[PDB]
Amino acid sequence: IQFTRHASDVLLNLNRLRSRDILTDVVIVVSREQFRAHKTVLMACSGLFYSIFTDQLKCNLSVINLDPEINPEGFCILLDFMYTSRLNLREGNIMAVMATAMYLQMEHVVDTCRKF
Amino acid sequence: CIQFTRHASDVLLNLNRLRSRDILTDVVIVVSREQFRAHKTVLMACSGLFYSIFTDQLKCNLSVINLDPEINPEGFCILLDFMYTSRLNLREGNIMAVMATAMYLQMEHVVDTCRKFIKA
Amino acid sequence: NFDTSLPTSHTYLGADMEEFHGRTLHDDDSCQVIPVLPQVMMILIPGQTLPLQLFHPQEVSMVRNLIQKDRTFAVLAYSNVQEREAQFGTTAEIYAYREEQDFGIEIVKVKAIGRQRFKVLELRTQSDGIQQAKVQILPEKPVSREDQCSYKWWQKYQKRKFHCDAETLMDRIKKQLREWDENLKDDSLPSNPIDFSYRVAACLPIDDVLRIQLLKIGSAIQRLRCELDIMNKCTSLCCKQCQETEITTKNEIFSLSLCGPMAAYVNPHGYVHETLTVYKACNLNLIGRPSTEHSWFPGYAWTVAQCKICASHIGWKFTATKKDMSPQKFWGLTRSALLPTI
Ligand SMILES: CN(c1ncc(Cl)c(Nc2ccc3c(c2)n(CCC(C)(C)O)c(=O)n3C)n1)C1CCN(c2ccc3c([C@H]4CCC(=O)NC4=O)nn(C)c3c2)CC1
Ligand SMILES: [Zn+2]
């Protein structure tokens, strides 16, 4: 047996946890702005985060600072896409979103951006 | 806006991959004198019982959780696998035990599926 | 002790809701095209409040466009769900609105109120999944309630008026409604026969076939007669999935909000329940521990209650938390999951 909506609903429940800031064990600092979340979810969506949190020394870090010049709006939108599988691209940010996805090693998102 | 109908399954697959290697797992559940290690966040996303347990400021700090001893361990394992893989392994030889365990765990849609299959 | 106006506010949705002061009535016996929402499985009666929380893209877009243009939509009284065919419906009007963005999620909270009844000629589905229906609009005592003063006074009234009825039927219905609620105050029930009949029809805990049969009636006196009969024949409520189990009796129900014994509430997932409040339930089993988030009755903690010999979901517990509250224990039950018996 397989559940058509189990994955989407589990993702929504994780997003509910994030919005309520429950058991969130890490905070990412991009452009001097903070975004709190869980390490497991981040490493499940990004090669960069997978590398960082599979590193036995860096996985203990509850605070992580990325490249400071990564656009904050792009990182926020990509985090929301991680937590809802939905990406709302727009004319005025697609380049920044693509650059941030490249930095995060999210190949499918970068490739999708290449098309638009 | 656009949608990635496989991204959620990919995330679940990565989480199951981490579980299979016991990476960042932070809780162990004891069912029928048998231990199963997992992440609290996933458990509370799939079970109301674990949601209540880990939303309780006193009990969330617990790293070891013991359930009702008479709950089927095989059903618990199958339900954990369903949590981590969107796949439920029902058979005539366990369906009732799985439904009972799901009711104990307060997993609505799982018990709904059990009822749907039992009705047929 | 509990305030009886609080539940009607539906505070759990959100205290800040953009609100609109307005009303629009279509000329009777006119022909107009109205949009209807993708799935609304309830026979909405004029004057009855309806809360919704919508999620779908097309739903949010169409309701947004609605509130921009005309602020009303249609609710079809489906004779049966699977066939999707119906011949009457009710226009609902938006009177409270709010749009909520939650970390990429989008939802819309809304509260509406029924206005007019109508007959549907035919309905056509446009490309974007919205259904547009062509539709023709259907046309429409002593200050003290002391016993003896009402007795001789009503005899005198009957003698004088018919020396050669609306008030009498309304009075008897009000007597029954008061039997349900001692605290009931007359000024709350409208004096206009039409509004009173609609309010009573909404309060009645009856199945949908009777609901539509009562909605089709075009005269206030006929509605009052039919309601009188139904009220004075209803015996008790039974689990829909057992066909015979006493969950509640006629005398156990007690109004707890101005709307009446029964009202409409909404779930965190957008599904709508019609809840009926009673201070005594039987053959119900509790699962879990008390919770209070998104509670329908502020100050009370709900616990799911399942038909214990049926394993089907029926209602809730609602135990008060503070120990100065009069109803330290009552129950809510879902009308959709139980049927009248006789
Ligand atoms: C915030 N929050 C949350 N946040 C984060 C997480 Cl992680 C999380 N997890 C979770 C928990 C428990 C699950 C579960 C997932 N799943 C999904 C499992 C899977 C595999 C499909 O994902 C499943 O089945 N259970 C049991 N739940 C929940 C809070 C409670 N809340 C709720 C509140 C009120 C009512 C009412 C009535 C009652 C009477 C009244 O007066 N008011 C009402 O509205 N009815 N209902 C239905 C209510 C539901 C639901 C959301
Ligand atoms: Zn039953």
The SS3 assignment for C240 reads coil
Cα(C99) to ligand 1 centroid in Å equals: 21
- For residues C251 and C323, membership in a common domain is answered with yes
Q: Give the closest of A10, A81, A86 to B12, CB-based.
A: A10
Put simply, the answer to whether A83 touches C102 (Cβ < 8 Å) is no
* CATH number of the domain enclosing B101: 3.30.710.10
Percent composition of chain B: helix, strand, coil (DSSP 3-state, to 5)? 55, 15, 30
Residue position matching structure tokens 């201070």 = C279
C8 within a domain of the structure (yes/no): no
Pick the residue from chain B with its C-alpha nearest to C291.
B52
Maximum alpha-carbon separation in chain A: 46
- Is B64 within 8 Å of chain A by CB? no
- For residues C291 and C182, membership in a common domain is answered with no
Encoded tokens for A105: 């090693």
Maximum alpha-carbon separation in chain B: 49
- For residues C221 and C273, membership in a common domain is answered with no
CA distance A68 to chain B (A): 27
Put simply, the answer to whether B87 touches A22 (Cβ < 8 Å) is no
Label residue B46 exposed, middle or buried (CB < 10 Å: 0-12, 13-18, 19+).
Answer: buried
CA distance B57 to chain C (A): 15
- For residues C201 and C124, membership in a common domain is answered with no
**Which residues lie closer than 8 Å to B105 by C-beta, 6 or more apart?**
B47, B48, B49, B50, B79
Name the domain count of chain C.
3
Neighbour count for residue C95 (Cβ, 10 Å): 17
- For residues C30 and C128, membership in a common domain is answered with yes
Structural domain containing residue C226:
168-234
The one-letter amino acid code at C103 reads F
- Is C289 within 8 Å of chain B by CB? yes
Cα(C240) to ligand 2 centroid in Å equals: 7
Residue position matching structure tokens 């609602």 = C318
Q: Tally the residues of chain C.
A: 342
CA separation for the pair C307, C283 (Å, rounded): 6
A18 within a domain of the structure (yes/no): yes
Label residue C188 exposed, middle or buried (CB < 10 Å: 0-12, 13-18, 19+).
Answer: middle
Structural domain containing residue A105:
6-115
* CATH number of the domain enclosing C126: 2.30.130.40
A1 within a domain of the structure (yes/no): no
Name the domain count of chain A.
1
- For residues C222 and C283, membership in a common domain is answered with no
What Rg value do the Cα atoms of chain B yield, rounded? 15
The SS3 assignment for B69 reads coil
B102 within a domain of the structure (yes/no): yes
Q: Which long-range contacts (CB under 8 A, 24 or more apart) does C14-20 make?
A: C14/C98, C14/C100, C14/C109, C16/C98, C17/C96, C17/C97, C17/C98, C17/C109, C17/C111, C18/C96, C18/C97, C18/C98, C19/C95, C19/C96, C19/C97, C20/C67, C20/C71, C20/C94, C20/C95, C20/C96, C20/C97
B1 within a domain of the structure (yes/no): no
C145 within a domain of the structure (yes/no): no
Residue position matching structure tokens 């579980």 = B19
- For residues C228 and C250, membership in a common domain is answered with no
